Symmetry: D3
């Protein structure tokens, strides 16, 4: 099981470390899969690179 | 926040529903983001489509 | 330029053909890039495989 | 409907804003889906990270 | 090192097994990384789901 | 045929150029597909962005 998470840039290294752990755990729990097989990738998006309804998230 | 999870095929609909909920929650908690903005995509892989060390996981 | 579009299953082949064309055009226009270089991938999601707010889109 | 677009680095913020809008619109039109549900992600590639025919795009 | 490869549907299981092996090896060689860490995912695309120049590959291809 | 490869940051431009070529070749060989149709994307990951067993690769 491999998870890729796209998020807006701006968060601390600690928050991201937590995200990885908590998501990894949730995956292991939910699928009864061994925690050590779980991979997580975080991909940060620039605010000018993410659109909702055709408009940037950097003015919503 | 949009999460795509690749997993081996073979799990039940219930397990997957759970995966979606628990992961969505963990994201919301971890980033202090509203739960309703979180999207999750599950992508099932066939066992013949996933390699480790150059060999199928189906072996 | 390569675009991948995740959409809920259930649309017609014609709608998807249109999607491919219209998006490919929009990319070419926007970036002043040659239309023939543009690649588009459509990835259909099962309704039981897409979550919003932790709950399936096949409820909401 | 969630679109991810990989493009070469080098474009202006305005061009990208236009890309997001025009693509979002093309998606909404093509699938008769509400514009406000459409998400777009732009992922910029470094010129040394994109290959065609095994050769960098930064010698093309 | 994790590779995802999108290909048109239609190939045999053997061809895909080969693809996985040859690509994993090329990755290991190129990056001096241990072969056993390399992951590969193959994702098959339906011919109606892949566009070139705004037109399906299933009307520009077999 | 379009390949995206996620790798840890830290490698030289030459190594990556080699990765692109060798992988592109392997794909062409394996699928009997024309080399010039093969696309490769390299995506570098920061060490703080990649988790194994819930822990950073650092
Ligand atoms: C990951 C980004 C999602 C949002 O910001 C939102 O929809 O509110
Ligand atoms: C592409 C998925 C998003 C929706 O359909 C929506 O939330 O409206
Ligand atoms: C990987 C699919 C692409 C083609 O078929 C091509 O570019 O000719
Ligand atoms: C890319 C796959 C994982 C690793 O690099 C590792 O095993 O550290």
């Amino acid at each position: 099981p491999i998870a890729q998470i796209h998020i807006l840039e701006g968060r601390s290294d600690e928050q991201k470390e937590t995200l990885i752990r908590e998501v990894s755990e949730a995956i292991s729990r939910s699928l009864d899969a061994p925690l050590t097989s779980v991979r997580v990738i975080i991909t940060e998006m620039a605010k000018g690179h993410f659109g909702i309804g055709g408009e940037l998230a950097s003015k919503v």
